[PDB]
Design a protein around this ligand. Structure first.
Ligand SMILES: O=C(O)CNC(=O)C(=O)O
Ligand SMILES: [Mn+2]
Length: 190
């Protein structure tokens, strides 16, 4: 329903490594972030395209000074995704344009620890993970507004991950029209 896989083996080994909690956020939680982030996002334009960047058609910011309503929500993520694993000083807020997308990559093992957790806002999209070593081993995730994903262990380190572009935005056989989508991403320290 939300996770698809190249085979039964990838699905089993990555069962608590790459996970999807759709409807992690209520409507009211969704609007709290949406509303809080819009001014600081509108305050910048969709930054320049440099062919070899991972992210295209995006603007972004790092936020650490949050409302009490928004802090409550990140703590929920923190609670649900991280253990004893310290957080980064701040949260990465990524605003993709409908025409924007994210190419396959692994997050900097230098700066990002062993867990990545993203909240998804506004519009649906699919994140694809492919084994770096083995192209045949992949998982696609359906990320809906209000969803939380967690990428940890081997899905963080031996798999690349990407958010598909509108012309490729498929979950199995089903087109998932791409719109503007904000991500709120929480990362662990090395
Ligand atoms: O949460 C997201 O939008 C996906 N995150 C990443 O792939 C990234 O920041 O490079
Ligand atoms: Mn990434």
């Amino acid at each position: 329903m939300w996770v698809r896989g190249s085979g039964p083996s990838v699905l089993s080994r990555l069962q608590d490594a790459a996970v999807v909690r759709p409807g992690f956020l209520s409507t009211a939680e969704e609007e709290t972030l949406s509303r809080e982030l819009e001014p600081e996002l509108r305050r910048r334009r969709y930054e320049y395209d440099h062919w070899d960047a991972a992210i295209h058609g995006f603007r972004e910011t790092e936020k650490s000074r949050w409302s009490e309503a928004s802090r409550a929500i990140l703590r929920r993520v923190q609670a649900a995704a991280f253990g004893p694993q310290t957080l980064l000083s701040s949260v990465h807020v990524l605003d993709l344009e409908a025409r924007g997308y994210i190419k396959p990559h692994v997050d900097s093992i230098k700066f990002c620890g062993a867990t990545i957790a993203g909240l998804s806002l506004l519009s649906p999209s699919v994140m694809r993970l492919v084994h770096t070593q083995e192209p045949g081993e992949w998982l696609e995730l359906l990320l809906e507004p209000g969803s939380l994903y967690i990428l940890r262990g081997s899905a963080r380190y031996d798999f690349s991950h990407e958010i598909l572009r509108d012309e490729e935005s498929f979950f199995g056989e089903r087109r998932i029209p791409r719109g503007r989508r904000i991500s709120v991403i929480c990362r662990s320290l090395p």
